[model samples]
Target: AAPTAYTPLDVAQAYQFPEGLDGQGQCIAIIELGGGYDEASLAQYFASLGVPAPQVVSVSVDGASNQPTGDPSGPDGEVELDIEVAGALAPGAKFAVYFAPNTDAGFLDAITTAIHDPTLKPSVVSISWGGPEDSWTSAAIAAMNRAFLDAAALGVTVLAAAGDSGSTDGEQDGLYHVDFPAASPYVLACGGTRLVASGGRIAQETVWNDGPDGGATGGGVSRIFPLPAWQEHANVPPSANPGASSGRGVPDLAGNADPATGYEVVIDGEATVIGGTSAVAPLFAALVARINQKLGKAVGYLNPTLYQLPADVFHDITEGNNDIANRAQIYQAGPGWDPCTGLGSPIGVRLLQALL
Candidate 1:
């Protein structure tokens, strides 16, 4: 297959994110489930991208450290994708990589540690792992949301992947579902898009959907959460749940995440391509860090600010649907907000202006 892979610079330029901020004086945090990062791979990635490698920090919690398992390909590919994308946007920003087991407890612990760890003091945290809201127990879900509340109060922006399965949320049940943590409403829920660029400009973009591979933007209405105040006036649409009129929207924002239009990454001493809502999480995470560096302070919990801005701040994806892999009755992109791609992908320069 020919490579149509988009690089970090491609996205940054396509969206017009600010340059010259240098991403210094800011720290970006990433929560990892299993799979560790390799400095050699990361260094090669940055060098190949023609940028200096950012400083990397490893923070261990819940009996996990930077240990590559599962395959000699160096842990799981998720670790590489998250770091590479974020690091590309903010190459000078300090990175605090928190490694944790893939358990329910470990996931929350990594998030909690990143929020409260004074030494890390991350202004932006990116989470690329989660399951549907129904998969988690009530107690755990509540505790996790409370952790996000702490993040909001402290002015730290947290971003989570909206999942990869269309609306069923990885379940065989014939109902639309949204991913947890992202559905918490405190964290920014990042969705996915299939991007096309020509001569450094975006040629086309639509909902990320590849049949049978389960590759698509994870969205739809969340069943466990109600509409939050920020989204109340934000013009969010009603839930896809037949019984519910309103529920929290899944993706607060979106980015290029289809493998066909994926990012070029170096993992396990080899270069490859990757995508998913996970890639979009770090892309926005780095954007927030850069905005923070540019403003000389942290800009936390972007939901309120994001919704207040003009619709022109993003590239509205008005094409494609979240229907793939045995899915029936999926969401589609539209004029305002839809489960397919929330608020659409960013126009980085406008977004920075809005945030500033």
Candidate 2:
């Protein structure tokens, strides 16, 4: 069957998120490696859904400026999608969009700048860019993880995409890999699922795996990081990379990220549909913003608290596999926590109640 695309609002409603919370006093910091957004495009995109646009401010890192390539298939798709999704869900929340160069130094600097920005004082930082742990230098990973820990201390929730290349994470080697920053214990890694929704209700959901060439949710045990204390009861499996040991399990949560059932958004002046674990990151970040507004304080470091909640707070995806690297089904989704889909997709209302 052909997949169906939905608006950001539809996805939010399907999750049954709390109502009347517009993220009034919250700020979401979005980290972009390249591309840009235009005022007109954003205005039109929000107007199409009868949603008021949120205040968006640009923050430059490493002298990088907002420059749109005008190609929907390029970075512009990611930039606009990040803004539109987060903006739509938290209409009253202010946005601090940080544009940085596509390098290790630039990525680290952008996160640090956003976390330390005195003016915005963001309560949540949304990161939609990253690579496998092995693809990064040890020093870079350590520095970025340190910044994430700082976010925790300041009561700021940090969300990162778990990558879109499935368990192998696009590495030429056959070993399964998890995306970095996400694999970092301090960050809440968001994974993907193919969701079917209508009439503000979910019909069916499963782990998103479109094969190696298409896309899939990235999840697995980390090769570098040791298992965190919070996931001690999650029954995390060992690395599928021959005899590699287990480490931090990726993707604390999941959301609709299949490109076929992607989000309806405007990119480069065109109504385009895009998807990835990238979409999942901002989706959760916006949810956190609304929670902050309701609780009158930020929900910092949600991974630990979330792990203690009952399975009813999530969909608990128990089917499908994320072996996109064709490793003969290296990681499978199941009861409790498996490499694929982690604790499964969020049940927004129940999750909020549990946190409170």
Candidate 3:
């Protein structure tokens, strides 16, 4: 099926966060596992939006293309969508696209290189690729988390996709799942949601559980990073297995990720649409850039401040769920925080302002 596309450009403009801030001073780095963008197409995209063109730089870690190359499994489509839209939202922000091999070693190395590179010096990094927590080794996970921690200590925030699969994460064995890197305590696990807007403001939001065979919203119990102390009272439900332990809950925040309302982009002159938690990461990253521009301070590790803001800063999704039952029924959204859609997508500038 074609991917959902919901880019929040109108919403960003409506909020007016880009007014005085020249993203020129900020560097946003994105890790692309597959595909690359055509510079000419990207230029036209920005011109069409009336936004100043962005400065885009590319680095290949594993001899990957510095621009988009077609990979059926790891389509450059989503990666291009993310880079273009994020740049569009924060036009003045400098962009660095790190092309890493899809393997674990290459991915980890690319991120480490970006973090340590003095020349790049990116303040925020967006990672849209990751597999289930079980598929990764504990040592590898720790090393990756350590890299994120180092970035955080340096005041850089890392954003990652919570996974395209729903709560179950398509585990062949009978088990619930969530994506790694997102589950890593050091990074923010961006989840997906269905967003309906009217008059340029968010109208409604729900768990990104769309069609029967569509990818599920990524969220579930974790076995890797232990639950952080901050979320102790955030109303997470208890597990049925008393002895079972949970990993760090994901989707610390959300944005428009539903394919139905997904974002629009052009690749090699072909207009296309894309959506997923992949879109959510860079979207929020751009939002963070705007917030940083407004506050004059990088908004590092936003989870603490987000939970403290007024509830209205977000439109709580009170309906829908992603938990599919063995009987073929899926989970429905509930009033408060559920595994499906956490806290809901952003509402207005109030939430960003509250942080400032």
Candidate 4:
């Protein structure tokens, strides 16, 4: 493997973000199940990029606080990657990080807290944790889905990672599974892509599928949720699992997420490169923050608006598949929306204009 890591600024440029907007007056809420971040290193990372560090506040949920494990390959990597990516792009926005236990209850509570917090009132929420649909209890699923619906009502844009374990979603049950929170119809599911750059512009982009062992973007139809009206025209397909019903599609959009072409970040006091659908959540969260700053309003529940936009506002990924280890071709990327990359990566300026 070679080093093809990119800075957050590079990603902002590659996405052609609107000029001169830094997400002022916006607060991006990030949900972390484990690991923690250090402010000093966070400031150092921003300084290295010639950007000001956004104010970051940590909120504990279910007894989980900002406790770093000092491992680059652990949950700390995820924490730092989310902060660094979002902070670098939306340098003027504040961050309200909610750290919670790695359980369904904790996950649900963190989201609800961030959504209803009167002081911060985050306009955008980024979640980088979740498992397959079947991995959760029915009660937990329904409860979490309701929390997301509440976020929509409050005009909070919620983005979740579509998972990084490919179509099987790390399940060895010989059936395809879509990741949840992402599979929930109320949230914007973020997928992954392998991006190549030449002279600070995207040279090529495709669905990220580095095989099962190396990780792949998780996607496919949800067995738990019905397809929302917003995606009716997107030509979503039925679940590949045996006797599974046609349901909501997983990822609504994608971004650079292949560790081979990943983000350069400071994790646990060391520089490391990381990627996954996890990175895509905060990546788009920052984009949403900037879009909110430009519009002076939050683009809450963005799936409907994104579905209505023309395809030119995105770099449609038409290649690759997230089949997992032993699975073969459960879902493939194509023009328009597909399981792997949804409507594909965003063209930031075009998206902002369309929303405006």
In model 1, which residue pairs have backbone atoms overlapping below 3 Å? none
Sort the candidates on TM-score, descending order: 2, 4, 1, 3
Q: Tell me, what's the RMSD of every candidate?
A: 1.8, 1.1, 3.0, 1.4
Candidate 3, 208-295: lDDT as tens digits: 8765476667876677667777667667554322455654666676666777767777666666666788887888788778777777
Task: Report the number of backbone clashes for model 4.
Answer: 0
Model 1 clash tally, residue pairs: 0
lDDT of each: 0.85, 0.90, 0.72, 0.90
Which stretches of candidate 2 lie above 4 Å from their native place? 1-3
Residue-level lDDT tens digits of model 4 in 195-258: 8877767888988989866899988998888888999999898887778578999899999999
What TM-score would every model get versus the actual structure?
Answer: 0.96, 0.98, 0.90, 0.97
Model 3 lDDT, full chain set: 0.72
Could you give me the TM-score of model 3 versus the true structure?
A: 0.90
Tens digits of per-residue lDDT, candidate 1, 137-232, equal 999999999999999999899999998888777787766788988898898999999988776667888899986574788988777888877777
C-alpha displacement of 349 in model 3, angstroms?
1.8
Q: Write the per-residue lDDT of candidate 2 for residues 134-190, one digit (tens) a residue.
A: 889899889998999998998889999999999888987757789988999999999
Cα misplacement distance, residue 335 of candidate 1 (Å): 0.7
